[PDB]
Amino acid sequence: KTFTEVQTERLEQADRSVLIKCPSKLNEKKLLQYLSSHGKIDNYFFFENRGIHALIEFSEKSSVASLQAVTGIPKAAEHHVVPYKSRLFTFTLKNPGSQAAEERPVKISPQSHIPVNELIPKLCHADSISSQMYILLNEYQLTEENIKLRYLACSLVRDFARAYFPDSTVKPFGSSVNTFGKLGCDVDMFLDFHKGPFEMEYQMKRLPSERLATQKILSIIGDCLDNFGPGYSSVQKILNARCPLVKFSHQPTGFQCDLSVSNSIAIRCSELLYIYGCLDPRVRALVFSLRCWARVHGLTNSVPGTWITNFSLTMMIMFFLQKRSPPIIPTLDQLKELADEKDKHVIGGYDCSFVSDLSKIKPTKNTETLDELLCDFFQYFGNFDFRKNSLNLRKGKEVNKPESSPLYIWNPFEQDLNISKNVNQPQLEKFVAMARESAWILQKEDKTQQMINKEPWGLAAVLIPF
Amino acid sequence: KTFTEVQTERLEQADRSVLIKCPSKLNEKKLLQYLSSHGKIDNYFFFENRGIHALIEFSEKSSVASLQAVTGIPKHVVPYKSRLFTFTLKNPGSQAAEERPVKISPQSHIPVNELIPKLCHADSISSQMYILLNEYQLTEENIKLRYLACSLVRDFARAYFPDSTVKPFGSSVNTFGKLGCDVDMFLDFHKGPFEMEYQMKRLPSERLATQKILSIIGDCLDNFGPGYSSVQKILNARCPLVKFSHQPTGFQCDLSVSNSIAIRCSELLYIYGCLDPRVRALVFSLRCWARVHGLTNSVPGTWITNFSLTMMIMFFLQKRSPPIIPTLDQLKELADEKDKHVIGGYDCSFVSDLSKIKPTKNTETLDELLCDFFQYFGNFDFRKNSLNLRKGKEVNKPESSPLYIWNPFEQDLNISKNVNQPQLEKFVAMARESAWILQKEDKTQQMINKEPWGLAAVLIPF
Numbered sequence: 006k007t008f009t010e011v012q013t014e015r016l017e018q019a020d021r022s023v024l025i026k027c028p029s030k031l032n033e034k035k036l037l038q039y040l041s042s043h044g045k046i047d048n049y050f051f052f053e054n055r056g057i058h059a060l061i062e063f064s065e066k067s068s069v070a071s072l073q074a075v076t077g078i079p080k081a082a083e084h085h086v087v088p089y090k091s092r093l094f095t096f097t098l099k100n101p102g103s104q105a106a107e108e109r110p111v112k113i114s115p116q117s118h119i120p121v122n123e124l125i126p127k128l129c130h131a132d133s134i135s136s137q138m139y140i141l142l143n144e145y146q147l148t149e150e151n152i153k154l155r156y157l158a159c160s161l162v163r164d165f166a167r168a169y170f171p172d173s174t175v176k177p178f179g180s181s182v183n184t185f186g187k188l189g190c191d192v193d194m195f196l197d198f199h200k201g202p203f204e205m206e207y208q209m210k211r212l213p214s215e216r217l218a219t220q221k222i223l224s225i226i227g228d229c230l231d232n233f234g235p236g237y238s239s240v241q242k243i244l245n246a247r248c249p250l251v252k253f254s255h256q257p258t259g260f261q262c263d264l265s266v267s268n269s270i271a272i273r274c275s276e277l278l279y280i281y282g283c284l285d286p287r288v289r290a291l292v293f294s295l296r297c298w299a300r301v302h303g304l305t306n307s308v309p310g311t312w313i314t315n316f317s318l319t320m321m322i323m324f325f326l327q328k329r330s331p332p333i334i335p336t337l338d339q340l341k342e343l344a345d346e347k348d349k350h351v352i353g354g355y356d357c358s359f360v361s362d363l364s365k366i367k368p369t370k371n372t373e374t375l376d377e378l379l380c381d382f383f384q385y386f387g388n389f390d391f392r393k394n395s396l397n398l399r400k401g402k403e404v405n406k407p408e409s410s411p412l413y414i415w416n417p418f419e420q421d422l423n424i425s426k427n428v429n430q431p432q433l434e435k436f437v438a439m440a441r442e443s444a445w446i447l448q449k450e451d452k453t454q455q456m457i458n459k460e461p462w463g464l465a466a467v468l469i470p471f
Numbered sequence: 472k473t474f475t476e477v478q479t480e481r482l483e484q485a486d487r488s489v490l491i492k493c494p495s496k497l498n499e500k501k502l503l504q505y506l507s508s509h510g511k512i513d514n515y516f517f518f519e520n521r522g523i524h525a526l527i528e529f530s531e532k533s534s535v536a537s538l539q540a541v542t543g544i545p546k547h548v549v550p551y552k553s554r555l556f557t558f559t560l561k562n563p564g565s566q567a568a569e570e571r572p573v574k575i576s577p578q579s580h581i582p583v584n585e586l587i588p589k590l591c592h593a594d595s596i597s598s599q600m601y602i603l604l605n606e607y608q609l610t611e612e613n614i615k616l617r618y619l620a621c622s623l624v625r626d627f628a629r630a631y632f633p634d635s636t637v638k639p640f641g642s643s644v645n646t647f648g649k650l651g652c653d654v655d656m657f658l659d660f661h662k663g664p665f666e667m668e669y670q671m672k673r674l675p676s677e678r679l680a681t682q683k684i685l686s687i688i689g690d691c692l693d694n695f696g697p698g699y700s701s702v703q704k705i706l707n708a709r710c711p712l713v714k715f716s717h718q719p720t721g722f723q724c725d726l727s728v729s730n731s732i733a734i735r736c737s738e739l740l741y742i743y744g745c746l747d748p749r750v751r752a753l754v755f756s757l758r759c760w761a762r763v764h765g766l767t768n769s770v771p772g773t774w775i776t777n778f779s780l781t782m783m784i785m786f787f788l789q790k791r792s793p794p795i796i797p798t799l800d801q802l803k804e805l806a807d808e809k810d811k812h813v814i815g816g817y818d819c820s821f822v823s824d825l826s827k828i829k830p831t832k833n834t835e836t837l838d839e840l841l842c843d844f845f846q847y848f849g850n851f852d853f854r855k856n857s858l859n860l861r862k863g864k865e866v867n868k869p870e871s872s873p874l875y876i877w878n879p880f881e882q883d884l885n886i887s888k889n890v891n892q893p894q895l896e897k898f899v900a901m902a903r904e905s906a907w908i909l910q911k912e913d914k915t916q917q918m919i920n921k922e923p924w925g926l927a928a929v930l931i932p933f
């Protein structure tokens with residue numbers, strides 16, 4: 006299945022889904038038996054976040070309308086509430102003293118990964134380094150339940166926008182959908198907004214220039230999220246940034262969210278990364294471990310600045326994997342060649358085209374183990390000449406740097422842009438030093454003796470401070 | 472019919488109506504012949520406001536949908552699809568054609584200067600006040616245009632709040648509306664073992680919710696909705712408010728969240744206006760009188776408001792021998808359990824059926840009532856007495872405000888508390904001068920001398 010098919014299918018599923026704040030005492034079967042009267046239920050689950058919440062995915066969207074019909078406005082807060090009716094519900098018993106079935110406990114689907122301290126033991130008790138990186142991956146990656154919750158959050162924000170742009174969509178991009186998302190990560194959202202003798206037309210208010218329109222639209226949705234709600238808080242409008250942005254927390258799901266107007270270049274990146282992530286499990290294994298490594302050594306940071314970003318790091322990892330013998334993943338120009346007329350995408354002059362079908366890509370013949378790749382990553386970039394060379398992911402080669410920035414990574418979809426232009430000399434040097442130390446640790450450590458000594462080894466040794 | 476029946480019927484008609492900005496050259500018949508293919512047309516008319524517009528009222532609401540189906544988006548824009556259309560000739564340069572002129576229904580009254588001659592050529596003062604009334608009152612076409620404006624804001628509000636209604640109140644629907652007046656709008660909201668409810672953020676008061684709602688709709692009207700301009704948010708007033716101009720209709724509009732006290736006032740005034748034509752005749756002439764003498768003003772302040780003046784006129788009419796209109800307490804008595812309306816402890820109940828009210832036996836002519844209005848309030852002790860419209864009597868003033876008129880639906884509120892001593896005194900003086908002019912003028916000699924007389928004499932500056 007292609008990225009685009011997965012997006013559509015996930016959004017269509019979210020479109021016919023709701024959230025129900027459950028009561029203290031909860032009989033799952035009765036609730037589901039009741040909710041099913043409004044229509045068939047394809048999927049559901051429960052999770053914990055300031056109480057027990059449940060996601061309900063109906064087979065028909067009409068089921069949502071049916072359920073909405075019988076739902077009421079909090080009688081306890083009559084004229085004291087903003088009567089905006091969304092898909093967030095709060096179920097309570099009609100006759101509290103008529104609970105007629107055995108109350109069982111419910112299975113709570115986890116929405117956050119276990120912390121680093123708890124992860125180290127599990128890594129240390131693994132057999133090899135490969136397995137360590139697969140433990141980490143499995144502990145960290147997004148669950149099916151979490152993904153559905155992310156798409157639903159998008160779907161609730163969409164409903165606000167459509168009020169006046171009926172054909173709009175709010176689509177997740179970035180780590181949420183590029184296969185490299187870890188539990189607890191932000192949800193990045195793109196708003197995408199576009200016979201007689203008389204020529205008949207609607208009267209419609211015109212919009213200003215692209216940027217100014219984006220700012221007003223995002224400002225108003227921000228205001229709505231803040232005031233029409235429910236569950237949105239810490240709504241922070243950052244409309245003056247290069248890319249206008251609204252940040253907000255969504256309390257029912259517990260996500261932190263970023264909303265901007267659609268940038269089709271950024272979506273192609275997400276699809277590019279999706280392909281790379283789907284082509285081979287080692288790709289995702291390496292990313293998750295190296296992201297974690299960077300965070301632990303203070304190379305990355307939650308606030309923008311001179312630090313390397315996960316996006317940049319992720320791109321450096323793809324470049325590494327492009328330069329193997331033989332390559333674990335193909336280059337972008339190779340994917341452009343395989344791209345037929347169905348997959349052609351030009352976005353402001355530059356050809357952002359590449360294949361969508363995974364079948365067309367021949368599998369790699371590379372059989373290197375993660376053990377070798379992790380150390381070689383550190384080895385490779387530890388001894389990389391960042392002053393003379395830059396990273397081109399189209400060619401998959403080291404080339405001369407168009408600009409004199411310390412760390413230059415060629416933006417694969419735009420001609421002379423550097424995705425890591427923010428990075429200064431100090432931060433790059435610290436990365437190189439951490440990379441070199443990490444390689445040294447791995448190359449010349451006694452793995453067996455450290456297991457005996459009950460001390461860190463392999464991935465675990467590079468995931469603790471120096 | 473009752474106020475409520477009229478509201479529903481007008482809103483149902485507006486619900487299945489649209490506006491069409493017509494082309495320069497216009498063949499009415501062809502256009503209507505075309506539009507009728509989408510369904511039957513109960514009513515239509517044309518008017519003039521930065522070009523020719525036409526209101527089309529279909530018999531079925533489905534006709535709107537049919538028409539909407541074939542309509543296209545301007546080939547940029549906020550693609551909000553409402554009921555405002557822009558028809559143009561497919562082939563402009565192949566028509567005469569269409570040089571047939573159309574009847575323009577007027578949406579504003581003729582100015583005061585043009586009105587004086589018509590008043591001076593009347594037979595009596597009664598007829599003068601009926602000329603003025605007829606020249607000024609809302610037309611059927613204008614009323615439909617007002618209800619339509621409400622209906623478009625409703626759809627527009629409904630984007631976020633599907634169960635909303637937008638209802639006109641005030642002068643638009645209390646029978647005392649004159650052409651060119653504002654359109655006041657109230658935004659109103661109306662199996663198994665579980666009691667299911669929405670999750671909604673709790674706000675400390677209705678007030679704070681009202682402000683946020685109106686602020687967002689304002690922003691949308693400004694940035695998304697078509698034909699709205701001069702959107703002015705006044706959320707800090709006693710009643711939160713958004714003002715805006717609606718360019719297609721040319722109305723100035725005021726939008727607030729439903730205040731049921733204000734609607735009862737509108738219905739109260741509707742009853743009084745419907746009980747007798749003299750009531751409406753007196754209001755329109757005395758409103759015009761106040762405006763001409765600078766007693767009233769378009770901007771709030773120390774001036775008497777039309778609402779206050781209108782209330783003073785009702786009080787006058789309550790105190791006739793016999794009364795031309797009944798008191799509020801009399802209407803409360805006749806109000807059955809069907810018409811009971813308590814709002815905030817205070818009983819805002821009164822009859823809705825006009826049949827239950829016995830007609831007045833008063834046969835006084837407008838001639839006498841106009842002069843007696845001036846006479847009555849000219850010699851009224853405003854320092855000792857206040858106006859109670861429930862009792863219909865002069866009573867001691869609960870507060871020491873210069874002009875005290877008892878708010879009929881709320882306890883110890885003064886609708887004219889804004890009025891100071893200077894402005895009241897000027898009113899009393901104008902009232903006294905106006906009475907004197909009328910009492911001791913030679914009506915016949917002034918007609919001979921080609922000069923003002925009667926109502927016309929009190930509608931020119933002194």
Ligand SMILES: Nc1nc2c(ncn2[C@@H]2O[C@H](COP(=O)(O)OP(=O)(O)OP(=O)(O)O)[C@@H](O)[C@H]2O)c(=O)[nH]1
Nearest residue numbers: 640641642643652653655733736737777778878886
């Ligand atoms: N009780 C009370 N109601 C008021 C007051 N001012 C305005 N209103 C209400 O608000 C409504 C609209 O006010 P306006 O639009 O200023 O006046 P109007 O009665 O519509 O008549 P115009 O002056 O022709 O617009 C009125 O019908 C009143 O019910 C006040 O001081 N007291």
Ligand SMILES: [Mg+2]
Nearest residue numbers: 180191192193
């Ligand atoms: Mg993110």
Ligand SMILES: [Mg+2]
Nearest residue numbers: 641642653655
């Ligand atoms: Mg008005």
